[PDB]
Design a protein around this ligand. Sequence first.
Ligand SMILES: *[C@@H]1O[C@H](CO)[C@@H](O)[C@H](O)[C@H]1NC(C)=O
Lengths: 281, 376, 98, 132, 278
Amino acid sequence: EPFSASVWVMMFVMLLLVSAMAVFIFEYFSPVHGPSFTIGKAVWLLWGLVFNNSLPVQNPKGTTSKIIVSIWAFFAVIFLASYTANLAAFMIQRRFVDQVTGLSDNKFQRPHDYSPPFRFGTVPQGSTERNIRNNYPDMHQYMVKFHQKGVQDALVSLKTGKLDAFIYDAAVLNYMAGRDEGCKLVTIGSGYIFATTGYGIALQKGSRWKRPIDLALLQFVGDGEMEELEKLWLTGICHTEKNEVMSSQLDIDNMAGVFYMLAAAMALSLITFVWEHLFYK
Amino acid sequence: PGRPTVPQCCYGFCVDLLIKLAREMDFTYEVHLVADGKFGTQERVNNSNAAAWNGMMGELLSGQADMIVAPLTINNERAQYIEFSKPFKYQGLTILVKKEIPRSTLDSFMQPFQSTLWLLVGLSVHVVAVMLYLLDRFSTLSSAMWFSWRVLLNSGLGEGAPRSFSARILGMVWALFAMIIVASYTANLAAFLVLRRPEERITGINDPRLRNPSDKFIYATVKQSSVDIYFRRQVELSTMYRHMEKHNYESAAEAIQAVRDNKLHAFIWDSAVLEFEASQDCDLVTTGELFFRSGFGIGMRKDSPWKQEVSLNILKSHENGFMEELDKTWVRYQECDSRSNAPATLTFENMAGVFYLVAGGIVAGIFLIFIEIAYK
Amino acid sequence: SQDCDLVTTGELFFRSGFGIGMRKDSPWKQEVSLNILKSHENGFMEELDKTWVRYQECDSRSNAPATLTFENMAGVFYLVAGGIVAGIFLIFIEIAYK
Amino acid sequence: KEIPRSTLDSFMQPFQSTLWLLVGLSVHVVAVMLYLLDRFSLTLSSAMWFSWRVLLNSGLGEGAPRSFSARILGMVWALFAMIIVASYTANLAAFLVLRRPEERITGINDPRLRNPSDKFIYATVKQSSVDI
Amino acid sequence: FLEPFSADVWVMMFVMLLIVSAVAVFVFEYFSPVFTIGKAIWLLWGLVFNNSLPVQNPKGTTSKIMVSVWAFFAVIFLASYTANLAAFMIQRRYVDQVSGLSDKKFQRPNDFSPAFRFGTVPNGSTERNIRNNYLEMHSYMVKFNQRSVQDALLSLKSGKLDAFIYDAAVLNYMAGRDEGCKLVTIGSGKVFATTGYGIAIQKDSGWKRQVDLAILQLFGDGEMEELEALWLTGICHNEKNEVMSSQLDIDNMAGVFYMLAAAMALSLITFIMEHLFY
Ligand SMILES: *[C@@H]1O[C@H](CO)[C@@H](O)[C@H](O)[C@H]1NC(C)=O
């Protein structure tokens, strides 16, 4: 598309250059069989040479056309090189990230409508169950139906596909990504949990060892060790660099997009048939 | 299998050094290898529960061997007991283990194969012929199909586009997309080239997997190895100390083998002994940053009036490049290929298949010419 | 996210969290937090952050083709037109010669 | 923000132009060499077109080699020309190598934290938690 | 493309032609009562390497089609060949020209026609050692001697000097704490005259062993690693450097161009030979 703002118009402009080249050429061809079809071939013949050759076309003779063509050929070559570079850039663009809206997504909000069978679930007796019941009661019931108990239950289920996906404290889940064997599990989008909280410690309501306790704790926040503890226990394998992916199945829906353009062209040719079908007297 | 003293021939870097000293030094030498498998470390003596380090060193305290010529790391725990010369080498502990990388022979074309559509659309290229016939109406099949095959393959056979100009527009479209597909493939071929599937676990000091050991971390060292002191003293590593201990070996040959045999996923040892082996086989790899650096020195019983001279002598060996010359002289002879990407004649077999298909083709060809004969 | 001429360094350090402030003997302290907790759980907090924060984003727009790189291509295009004119008279002279 | 990058014509100067000048000259010599023997036992222009056919990849096909020896010559030179353009496709490949590594600065690892560079000034807000 | 070129690809290409040649003569002759020549060789040539071949196309149905299949697979291989060379382009060891002084290039500047340059700080253990072992290097380098390490750095950094030589710890820290990351340690920075910093004492009477003990306790505690990260640790950690879009350089293709010229000469004298046959 980027070539299109400047490049696509110039291609049309490129055809206009071709007419001038033909004009120089026509005089040379006939100072004064039916080579006149050549200009048409050039529009088509020139065009074929533009994209990766592969045109039997027709053999132009006029001396000027060979130079003019070589100038265009040069262009076509560097175009292709440019096209390859753009494709080369895409290989970078071909990074596959998870496509989901998490809790917000309709797959979660209205699970029944989808034909495919998928289920989300969480651990029993959790703080969230309540959030779910205070978000969607029905969703909580669905989670209750497919209840698991241990991390590894969920894990295996996810690795086996018994469980479609799994919601839990992100911190732990991040740690799970921190410890996956094979790195097949990721967080939602960026990983914002969408529930915001931090760990807390109980104290007798009457008790206040915490107000006194608080002071010690902050400096601890400030101190480098929390991060040491992080590095000590929270360090996780496969840090999420904008991930990059490749496919042995290529793309069949992108291919379909291509084929839709193709199909459009087929329709256009049918229209030109119609024009001849109903050609004016 | 039964081990008893044995007369043997031994040749080494340390031997050349020793004789170098012997020419430089008046003292004459007779060498016998220590009976103990390990150099040895100070340990509880069973019921007595208190004992000399033994092995190579205790024999030294004991006086069995007056002087110790070996590639031994120099540390304070040992140092109080005995004098040590200036250290010859500065080797650091790394973990010598690797997994052969996984690469694909069938992966590049596969991008089509699995896409499935790559084939199906080829057939639809053939179908476009039917549309062209439609174009012909109200203005050969073999030629058409062949023509379609050419656009995938730039055949340029001869006849060209249908008489209708409009019909011919699709030719541009289908060849357009064919071109695009090929190029796209090439890009995805490069996507294979991008790789990076492998994940490095080498930074051990900052590593997460190594610290929290498990049955997936069957990790060891050599039974009674200096690193054990590090694990010993490092209460921080107690967990690892035991995790390590339970899997330890009497020697490097078995310790390297376990990783090679794949009995043990990881092996921990120092650089001087290990890197040479890393060059020697190389399937296995060293990872991370050397930790706990040390320089090798000769071990001798205290008060040796020669240690000082020895230190001067080895100092000279460094000064005159002798030490250096020797290290290049043996180590240099072993090399490991730098990371690089080469095709290696793998993916070529599909083409082997093509040539096999050629044979099938020409066999079919006798029936194809029969057809001309049949219309006889 | 609002000014594309400015960017952040990647590392995040000194992780910390902001909060409301009152004197220790304030009679609204118990009430103020319960309210904050309720707003987090309810989603009110997400509405405010999403409402205000979501207005702006920076993305890696433009790809790499044509554009500035294509400007010198203009020069290339200028080079094709110039060459043909000399050949006209020169070619005619060559024809006259032989 | 970081600085931008140069246009393709500018990019061409680093590799494309010198090779084009040297190689283009080389093609004429190769064309002359085949004729030598042929001459012994606009032909030059035709030879140039045949050799240029590879470069632009126009493949005008205006002319064909005079003798079997030339074809071996063509077999030699034609293959070389193909290699030369494939190396031009390597040049094609080189254009996509323009991606910039750039720079990032670590909170503690980076040199700036190590020293407030005299040339490199950094700061925060006065009487703030960051100051503390 | 070296492995594929080395084996099977060429032999297979001959067979396809040969199969076609047998079939084409028999089939073509089958098609017309009233031939595989060089043109067939060109066809192996046309199908095999990105077209650009104008000589001919065989007049038969079975072989021609088979080759179009070949060509399509061959194109894949061509594409892969491009990718193979792209793999080269992906990374490169831009460290090819280096001297470790055991080469003798440093031993003499004069052997190399342009004047080379290297220098070190005078009144150093390095300079004294140099004078002791290598005289010529000292006597030559006296001109390239520099006032101070910042100034020695000025001679390296702004140009007017190629290489600088100094203590390895300082040079390694300097590499890490480099304003420009272009400066890199020689080779692996593996140093000759392997040495370490030392602490003075008077003579045989002194702290002796008790003092050394403390030192190796530091290693055990692990403080030195922390202190290394804080004081010693280096910017732009010395990974193998990666070069992108480096100016094109040809040396092996130059060889190929020479192969071409030689092959031509052979065919020219072959024609002479043939002529003589007569
Ligand atoms: C060594 O330093 C001393 C004191 O600055 C100076 O006098 C002398 O010139 C220096 N050595 C030489 C000859 O460069």
